[PDB]
Design a protein around this motif. Structure first.
Motif, PDB file in Angstrom:
ATOM      1  N   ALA A   1      -5.660   1.767  16.983  1.00 55.08           N
ATOM      2  CA  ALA A   1      -5.030   0.536  17.449  1.00 55.08           C
ATOM      3  C   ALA A   1      -3.513   0.661  17.585  1.00 55.08           C
ATOM      4  CB  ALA A   1      -5.380  -0.613  16.508  1.00 55.08           C
TER       5      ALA A   1
ATOM      6  N   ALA B   1       5.544   2.993   2.018  1.00 57.82           N
ATOM      7  CA  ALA B   1       4.716   1.821   1.796  1.00 57.82           C
ATOM      8  C   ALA B   1       4.542   0.923   3.010  1.00 57.82           C
ATOM      9  CB  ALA B   1       5.276   1.004   0.640  1.00 57.82           C
ATOM     10  N   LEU B   2       3.340   0.371   3.126  1.00 57.45           N
ATOM     11  CA  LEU B   2       2.999  -0.573   4.176  1.00 57.45           C
ATOM     12  C   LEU B   2       3.059  -1.865   3.364  1.00 57.45           C
ATOM     13  CD1 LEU B   2      -0.204  -0.176   6.401  1.00 57.45           C
ATOM     14  CD2 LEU B   2       1.865  -1.497   6.872  1.00 57.45           C
TER      15      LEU B   2
ATOM     16  N   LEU C   1      16.295  -5.002   6.509  1.00 56.85           N
ATOM     17  CA  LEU C   1      15.431  -4.093   7.260  1.00 56.85           C
ATOM     18  C   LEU C   1      14.555  -4.824   8.272  1.00 56.85           C
ATOM     19  CD1 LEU C   1      14.220  -1.922   4.263  1.00 56.85           C
ATOM     20  CD2 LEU C   1      16.147  -1.459   5.806  1.00 56.85           C
ATOM     21  N   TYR C   2      14.020  -4.063   9.223  1.00 56.83           N
ATOM     22  CA  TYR C   2      13.140  -4.601  10.252  1.00 56.83           C
ATOM     23  C   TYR C   2      11.966  -5.252   9.539  1.00 56.83           C
ATOM     24  CZ  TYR C   2      10.087  -4.678  14.409  1.00 56.83           C
ATOM     25  OH  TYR C   2       9.275  -5.038  15.456  1.00 56.83           O
TER      26      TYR C   2
ATOM     27  N   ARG D   1      -9.655   3.022  12.716  1.00 56.97           N
ATOM     28  CA  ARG D   1      -9.459   1.903  13.633  1.00 56.97           C
ATOM     29  C   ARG D   1      -7.980   1.529  13.729  1.00 56.97           C
ATOM     30  NH1 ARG D   1     -13.361  -3.048  12.125  1.00 56.97           N
ATOM     31  NH2 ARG D   1     -11.558  -4.000  13.189  1.00 56.97           N
TER      32      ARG D   1
ATOM     33  N   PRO E   1       6.948  -7.109  13.850  1.00 60.72           N
ATOM     34  CA  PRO E   1       6.836  -8.100  14.922  1.00 60.72           C
ATOM     35  C   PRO E   1       6.223  -9.414  14.450  1.00 60.72           C
ATOM     36  CG  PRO E   1       4.951  -6.707  15.022  1.00 60.72           C
ATOM     37  CD  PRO E   1       5.878  -6.096  13.966  1.00 60.72           C
TER      38      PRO E   1
ATOM     39  N   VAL F   1       0.911  -1.132   0.000  1.00 61.90           N
ATOM     40  CA  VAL F   1       0.000   0.000   0.000  1.00 61.90           C
ATOM     41  C   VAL F   1       0.950   1.181   0.000  1.00 61.90           C
ATOM     42  CG1 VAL F   1      -1.810   1.246   1.220  1.00 61.90           C
ATOM     43  CG2 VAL F   1      -1.749  -1.261   1.281  1.00 61.90           C
TER      44      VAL F   1
ATOM     45  N   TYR G   1      -8.340  -3.074   7.513  1.00 64.41           N
ATOM     46  CA  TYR G   1      -7.683  -2.092   6.655  1.00 64.41           C
ATOM     47  C   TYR G   1      -7.497  -2.696   5.247  1.00 64.41           C
ATOM     48  CZ  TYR G   1      -3.792   0.961   5.070  1.00 64.41           C
ATOM     49  OH  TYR G   1      -2.947   1.807   4.391  1.00 64.41           O
TER      50      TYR G   1
ATOM     51  N   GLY H   1      15.301   1.014  12.054  1.00 63.65           N
ATOM     52  CA  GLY H   1      14.630   0.305  10.975  1.00 63.65           C
ATOM     53  C   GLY H   1      15.490  -0.703  10.232  1.00 63.65           C
ATOM     54  N   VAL H   2      16.791  -0.702  10.512  1.00 66.28           N
ATOM     55  CA  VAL H   2      17.718  -1.630   9.882  1.00 66.28           C
ATOM     56  C   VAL H   2      18.130  -2.647  10.942  1.00 66.28           C
ATOM     57  CG1 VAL H   2      19.919  -1.893   8.726  1.00 66.28           C
ATOM     58  CG2 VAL H   2      18.570   0.153   8.337  1.00 66.28           C
ATOM     59  N   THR H   3      17.706  -3.894  10.766  1.00 69.50           N
ATOM     60  CA  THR H   3      18.008  -4.941  11.732  1.00 69.50           C
ATOM     61  C   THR H   3      19.404  -5.564  11.569  1.00 69.50           C
ATOM     62  OG1 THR H   3      17.224  -7.103  12.599  1.00 69.50           O
ATOM     63  CG2 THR H   3      16.746  -6.585  10.305  1.00 69.50           C
TER      64      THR H   3
ATOM     65  N   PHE I   1       7.022  -1.862   7.376  1.00 67.69           N
ATOM     66  CA  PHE I   1       6.808  -0.499   6.945  1.00 67.69           C
ATOM     67  C   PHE I   1       8.081  -0.046   6.247  1.00 67.69           C
ATOM     68  CE2 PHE I   1       6.675   4.118   7.134  1.00 67.69           C
ATOM     69  CZ  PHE I   1       5.403   4.321   6.614  1.00 67.69           C
TER      70      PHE I   1
ATOM     71  N   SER J   1      -7.512  -4.926  13.167  1.00 70.07           N
ATOM     72  CA  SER J   1      -7.521  -3.629  12.518  1.00 70.07           C
ATOM     73  C   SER J   1      -6.753  -3.719  11.197  1.00 70.07           C
ATOM     74  CB  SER J   1      -6.906  -2.579  13.435  1.00 70.07           C
ATOM     75  OG  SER J   1      -7.749  -2.353  14.554  1.00 70.07           O
ATOM     76  N   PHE J   2      -5.658  -4.482  11.184  1.00 70.37           N
ATOM     77  CA  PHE J   2      -4.880  -4.664   9.958  1.00 70.37           C
ATOM     78  C   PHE J   2      -5.725  -5.379   8.910  1.00 70.37           C
ATOM     79  CE2 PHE J   2      -0.604  -4.280  12.218  1.00 70.37           C
ATOM     80  CZ  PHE J   2      -0.190  -3.176  11.468  1.00 70.37           C
TER      81      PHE J   2
ATOM     82  N   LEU K   1      -5.260  -5.201  17.364  1.00 71.94           N
ATOM     83  CA  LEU K   1      -4.319  -4.692  16.376  1.00 71.94           C
ATOM     84  C   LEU K   1      -4.409  -5.495  15.093  1.00 71.94           C
ATOM     85  CD1 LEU K   1      -0.552  -3.901  16.733  1.00 71.94           C
ATOM     86  CD2 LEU K   1      -2.275  -3.049  15.153  1.00 71.94           C
TER      87      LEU K   1
ATOM     88  N   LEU L   1       1.006 -10.037  18.888  1.00 76.88           N
ATOM     89  CA  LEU L   1       0.078  -8.921  18.785  1.00 76.88           C
ATOM     90  C   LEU L   1      -1.325  -9.315  19.214  1.00 76.88           C
ATOM     91  CD1 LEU L   1       1.169  -7.588  15.267  1.00 76.88           C
ATOM     92  CD2 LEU L   1       2.011  -6.874  17.522  1.00 76.88           C
TER      93      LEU L   1
ATOM     94  N   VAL M   1       4.132  -7.875   8.569  1.00 81.27           N
ATOM     95  CA  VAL M   1       3.696  -6.514   8.290  1.00 81.27           C
ATOM     96  C   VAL M   1       4.932  -5.650   8.478  1.00 81.27           C
ATOM     97  CG1 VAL M   1       2.284  -4.551   8.949  1.00 81.27           C
ATOM     98  CG2 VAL M   1       1.369  -6.866   9.149  1.00 81.27           C
TER      99      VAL M   1
ATOM    100  N   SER N   1     -12.011   2.020   8.738  1.00 82.80           N
ATOM    101  CA  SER N   1     -10.969   1.015   8.938  1.00 82.80           C
ATOM    102  C   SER N   1      -9.625   1.688   9.227  1.00 82.80           C
ATOM    103  CB  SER N   1     -10.839   0.130   7.694  1.00 82.80           C
ATOM    104  OG  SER N   1     -10.420   0.887   6.568  1.00 82.80           O
TER     105      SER N   1
END
Lengths: 182, 182, 182
Positions: free
Chosen positions: C10, A84-85, A124-125, C6, A128, A78, A144, C41-43, A103, A140-141, A137, A133, A101, C3
């Motif tokens: 959340a 982007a997600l 990158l991360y 929400r 979780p 998205v 969405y 953000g970088v693991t 980001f 909600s994802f 949460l 979770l 998930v 959504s």
């Protein structure tokens, strides 16, 4: 010479037999608003649709694990405002299952599908573990994604379309090998 | 200082001992018509031979799965007229086992071994599951490969050559680390 | 619309709750002489330190296998004179475990982390199976790494730092998704 003649005959025979076998998948109608990027011989196709200022991108990433039931993996992006997600998902029995998930602040990198881009994003991360979770949460994802058309209907279309194109790719496979060996 | 001296002595000792151990593989004679692209320190070598207008290319792709018996994976490409028939295979006890059969219209892409080329090809149709094919077809594929020299003799040469080069790479490994730490 | 509202609520709720949960890792002090290349953000971060004329580089390469205990994989490179000794390792309970020992004549290639560089190195000799080496050799390798600071203290710092940054990445993850959906 002879071996090539045998392979030529064998592929033609299979092509002819295959076309007479029952169960040939019918071509699914593409969900409203979605565009599809699929070419003969390419199994990992991509789907796209706009959602106001955002663009929703579906990219098949593979098929996995030994299984009686075929499970496909795909990424749902998205994109909006240069970010982007990214949902790492898989289709299991007509339903979407969220596995990850992430980001991505660098939307351009998120969209880049080169081997180099993949490696950079692999560092990158990855978000979780969904298991850590709470439902509020996670739900909600899912809501969405559903508001954007990423629902069971789409998951259902993906399986149906994949079966139909696999069948088409198989016949094109037989034909091209036949021509090649001839 | 001391640790480096210890590592220097240890590698020299192993190099000297190794050379006295029995079982040192002997260097196999390369099958007629085949050329080989192998350099010290490079485990995944490639072999090539012409077959009239076609070129046959053997590229080792790895070693896999926990195993008492060492199984190697390799791709066999048959290129002609800008297209390629690509056999995904593995050597199991001196014999070639076909795992996949793909067809590549873009022969140039098929030959390209860059990381980027690999990713692009990973999205293409990978052919049918060999288990869904009748013997007449599968046997024709095996006969086609055999007519081109891809037989048990070649599979046998691959194991033998791999053992010999592994042994050579191991000794070069000991020597280069010794020099490095010295 | 709803959504997204929400999801916005959340993520904010989780961010607020998370910050009140006990167990929040504390930030570890970086070992003397080591520099660290880590960005939010970088693991997979990298660590570097000089050892006279050599440079020691630590690059996290991943997390693996289903596990009650989290095990991380990383490469340790010792570069000098245009060449590199590359240790494939993993951290298991505060200790370094050597899985592979490779030697790279082309140090520049060894340092190159591009997807293309990775593929080229994947075709090189990966050294012997540690299980086929006597203790005198293996122990010398461990002592060599220890003399350069690659010890339990560093392994311990890697776990601690990873937990702390994972926690930070998680909160940044929640916040960025919240802003995105808002």
């Amino acid at each position: 010479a002879v071996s090539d003649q045998r392979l030529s005959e064998a592929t033609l025979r299979e092509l002819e037999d295959e076309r007479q076998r029952a169960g040939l998948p019918e071509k699914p109608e593409i969900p409203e608003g979605w565009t599809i990027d699929r070419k003969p011989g390419v199994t990992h196709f991509t789907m796209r649709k706009s959602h106001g200022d955002e663009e929703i991108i579906l990219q098949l990433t593979g098929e996995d694990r030994s299984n009686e039931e075929i499970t496909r993996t795909l990424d749902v992006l998205v994109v909006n405002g240069g970010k982007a997600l990214v949902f790492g998902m898989s289709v299991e029995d007509g339903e979407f299952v969220i596995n990850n998930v992430c980001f991505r602040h660098d939307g351009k990198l998120a969209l880049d599908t080169s081997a180099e881009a993949q490696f950079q994003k692999s560092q990158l991360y990855m978000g979780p573990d969904l298991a850590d979770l709470e439902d509020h949460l996670v739900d909600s994802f899912t809501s969405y994604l559903s508001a954007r058309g990423v629902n069971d209907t789409l998951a259902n279309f993906i399986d149906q379309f994949s079966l139909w194109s696999e069948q088409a790719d198989y016949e094109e496979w037989l034909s091209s090998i036949n021509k090649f060996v001839s």
